[PDB]
């Protein structure tokens, strides 16, 4: 009865989306000129870790980055000189995500311990200390992002995401409805909305100020492992074990384009956009990362010399370089 | 060349590198084990004998063990399973007593079948393709009482064997040993009465055999 109501809505709404669907990115972008053959070359190789690298993040300065690996250590790298600024020994070795505060004063990490740890980089004692132990989740931490110096959003295996107040240590908001391990999230540039992908083969856009999902995106055949916003914060792209990448338009509530190739059969671990958004980068379980033209949906150039699954990938804020982390305990800077 | 500030920064980075290498070398000595039970399996009993991941470490015969169990992780095991890929071995606890016990959810799911299927899924995983498995069949006293007065046919319909009991225990042991497609990977099984005190010895022997097998693989004697 109420289930039938939900179905009829799901039906009418679909008949309405198809209405706002006359053209396709391709048809509209069939006259733009191809980007070319992007040929990036490793410029730096960070080889300090001793185990699989599971996450990495760039600082807003576009020079320092933080990477987390299963050896229970966080490393702050100076990409320009390949120097190690800090080495943070993690209480729990099972870390699967890390984040860099936009101000650069804090770094957050989390993993299979179900808690998110916040580390203070600027201290009078000149050492990295754990400032807060955000422990409200039930499942493993999946992703973390800093809204500001005192707010952070996390995703876990509870099929839920939470917004935290670091000083208080309490979840100020909770986002439920993913019915599947939330596996990643991204923050819009306006910093008032964010999206998350889950194993339920759907991604939902959330309003941080309110706390409720506004738009739910579907049409993805398998789990979702990576999500990233378009530079203008008006669309986003998602990876998956389906071996396909896709981007959706917030104001269209629809899929815009699909990035899949017959030769490619494997999952996608991470996605990222170039500064202008013309280039979409995605790490693959095939040990390599491909580069896709944003509008033409063509693999501009394959780009990887990693020895195992490319776990994490990130483009600098200045767009100057792209860093790829893999399960071979190696980080490579491509330019 | 570089300025004094960069010289100092490079010296700090080199010190960090040396410390990191020393920590890694020190940590590489211990052996890591993954504990994978099933509900009411005797994994809790094994741990007692000695909210997220629970780590229990101990030293036996100048050897350091790190035993991890994911019990509070109610999420899908498909994810985060790859984390324990470079692990020395697995520990699997099946309750012999489960032979006659539909799962608590009463989905007509034979407790043992759920375990047989769970064991099959764990053994034939992409990761953990070469990780020897230590199998524990505890609650022999229970199995011992139930095996008499109730047939194993209920669990294994194609019993075709004597009802009691060591033979029944061999049927179930072999049924678990099956569905191991990969060669060069052995499953060590033990019968636990729930009050024995040599399970540490058995796990130590299994780990030493695994280490010996690994060392004979480097020599190329796969």
């Amino acid at each position, epitope marked *: 009865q109420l289930r039938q109501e939900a179905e009829q809505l799901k039906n009418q709404i679909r008949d309405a989306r198809k209405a706002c669907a006359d053209a396709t990115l391709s048809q509209i972008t069939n006259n733009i000129d191809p980007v070319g053959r992007i040929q990036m070359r490793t410029r730096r190789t960070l080889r300090g870790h001793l185990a699989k690298i599971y996450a990495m993040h760039w600082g807003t300065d576009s*020079r*320092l980055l933080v990477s987390a690996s299963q050896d229970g250590k966080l490393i702050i790298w*100076d990409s320009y000189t390949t*120097n190690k*600024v*800090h080495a943070i020994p993690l209480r729990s070795s099972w870390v699967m995500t890390c984040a860099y505060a936009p101000s650069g004063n804090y770094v957050a990490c989390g993993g299979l311990d179900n808690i998110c740890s916040i580390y203070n980089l*600027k201290t*009078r*004692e*000149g*050492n990295v200390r754990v400032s807060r132990e955000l422990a409200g989740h039930t499942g493993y931490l999946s992703c973390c992002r800093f809204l500001d110096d005192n707010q952070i959003v996390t995703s876990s295996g509870d099929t839920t995401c939470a917004l935290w107040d670091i000083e208080t240590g309490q979840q100020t908001t909770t986002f439920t409805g993913h019915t599947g391990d939330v596996m990643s999230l991204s923050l819009a540039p306006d910093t008032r909305l964010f999206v998350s992908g889950a194993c339920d083969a759907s991604a939902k856009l959330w309003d941080v100020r309110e706390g409720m999902c506004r738009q739910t995106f579907t049409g993805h055949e398998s789990d979702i492992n990576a999500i990233c916003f378009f530079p203008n914060g008006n669309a986003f792209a998602t990876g998956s074990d389906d071996a396909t990448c896709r981007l959706f338009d917030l104001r269209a509530d629809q899929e815009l384009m699909t990035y899949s190739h017959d030769n490619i059969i494997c999952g996608i671990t991470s996605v990222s956009f170039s500064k202008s958004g013309r280039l979409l980068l995605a790490g693959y379980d095939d040990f390599n990362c491909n580069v896709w033209d944003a509008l033409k949906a063509d693999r501009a150039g394959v780009l990887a010399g990693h020895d195992n699954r490319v776990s994490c990938l990130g483009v600098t804020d200045d767009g100057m370089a792209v860093a790829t982390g893999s399960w071979d305990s190696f980080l490579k800077i491509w330019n | 060349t570089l*300025s*004094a*500030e*960069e*010289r*100092a*920064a490079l*010296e*700090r*980075s080199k*010190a960090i590198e040396k410390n990191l290498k020393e920590d890694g070398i020190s940590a590489a000595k211990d052996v890591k084990l993954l504990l994978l039970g099933a509900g009411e399996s005797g994994k809790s009993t094994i741990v007692k004998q000695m909210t997220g991941i629970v780590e229990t470490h101990f030293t036996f015969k100048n050897l350091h063990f790190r035993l991890f169990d994911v019990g509070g992780q109610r999420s899908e095991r498909k994810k985060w399973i790859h984390c324990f890929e470079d692990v020395t071995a697995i520990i699997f606890c099946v309750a012999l007593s489960g032979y006659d016990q539909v799962l608590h959810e009463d989905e007509t799911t034979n407790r043992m079948h759920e375990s047989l299927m769970l064991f099959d899924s764990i053994c034939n995983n992409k990761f953990f393709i070469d990780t020897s498995i230590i199998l524990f069949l505890n609650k022999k006293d229970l199995f011992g009482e139930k095996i008499k007065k109730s047939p194993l046919t209920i669990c294994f319909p194609e019993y075709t064997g004597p009802n009691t009991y060591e033979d029944a225990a061999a049927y179930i042991q072999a049924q678990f040993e099956s569905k191991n497609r990969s060669p060069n990977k052995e499953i060590y099984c033990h019968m636990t009465c729930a009050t024995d005190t040599n399970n540490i010895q058995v796990v130590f022997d299994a780990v030493t055999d695994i280490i010996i097998a690994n060392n004979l693989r480097g020599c190329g004697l796969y």
Partner: single-chain antibody
Amino acid sequence: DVQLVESGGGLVQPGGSRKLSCSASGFAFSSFGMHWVRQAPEKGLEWVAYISSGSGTIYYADTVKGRFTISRDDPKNTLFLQMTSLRSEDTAMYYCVRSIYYYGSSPFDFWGQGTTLTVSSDIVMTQATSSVPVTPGESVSISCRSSKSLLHSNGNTYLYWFLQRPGQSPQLLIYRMSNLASGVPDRFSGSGSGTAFTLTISRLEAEDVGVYYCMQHLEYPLTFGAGTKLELK
């Protein structure tokens, strides 16, 4: 919290030997490089010695070489300076300064209270002025000059500014002639070319009266300019 105390000074006849030490507490002493800075009884600041964080790098001044040795014992969080064949001009005031070197660091951020001692080429920073007549509520600028350009190929000009209020230890104000030390009023502002540097003080008050020193960290030995003093006409 963080503080450095040193006490090894006293009346020493010329040609003798003495040992100086400052105990470090409230911070990770083992992770900081330590410096010794000497100030003559009348005026002036001059670098003395430096020992790296891992005690793998050591430097000395010309006169310090061959007579002074710098040692540290991280377990006991203590810094040591050994004096031999002390000269009559060696009588001065000694400070031990912490300093940590990594990307975006603030070396020379904390200074000790110091210990007095009595007895009986290189870059030339040039703080031309020696006294500046000023009144509260009006701006003031102090300029520092260097012999060679401090702008490294990195893009960082290693120029530092310190304030030493009367009767108290000097404190870091600006590092790299563009950054502001933590817990420093925003009115301070450092800027300049690769060879000339200046400061801007807005709405000056009686609390800023003192002497300012500009130091270069481009290469050893570290050099200080004479100071520029402020008054209250």
